[PDB]
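Let's do one together. I've listed all components of the complex below, 222 residues spread over two lines.
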Amino acid sequence: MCYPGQAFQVPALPACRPLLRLQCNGSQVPEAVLRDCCQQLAHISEWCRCGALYSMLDSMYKEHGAFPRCRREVVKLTAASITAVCRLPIVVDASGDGAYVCKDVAAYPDA
Amino acid sequence: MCYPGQAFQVPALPACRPLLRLQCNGSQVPEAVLRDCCQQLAHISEWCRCGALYSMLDSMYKEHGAFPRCRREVVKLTAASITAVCRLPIVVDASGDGAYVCKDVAAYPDA
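Okay, and this is what the predicted structure of the assembly comes out as:
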């Protein structure tokens, strides 16, 4: 498993929270804020990148709205594909199947 | 409405079909095939970009498997965020609410 606090820093992905708040209502995202988020994702292993994003999303909602001018549905869809916009692959599960997209995050707060 | 054949060329987004097949199992995507997909998306209006993507995905499934080594769930999640990886905004509905992500495509074959 990907243990919060060691597979990835907690609070998870500080650089990616400002990215998600811009993206979820279609604002323009500066290159620097995209770059910093992706650099932070890059350091986490392929196996744990979706876990870090799940933790981040859960933290934002549990602190909280957490996402001004953003719809619930598009928020969790945007968080689930940040790793795609970074062109960072993830491994879907124990098979080693790869993808660019986090389905567990897209189904938050369940999967 | 976005009419197939006039809001966008049909078959929809030829250049994006190879992108989606690489992405949906986490393969490396060449800059040329990303570029050509985004170029095609860029020409479609903010209002019809998700419609072009829905049409493309539907065609791929209706011709068909359509996605070798890809899971159903990650396929439609990947198609829903091709517009995010291109940094192209869409309008979510009649409100004019913006986003980078197509929720109707993520819910295929329903929404």
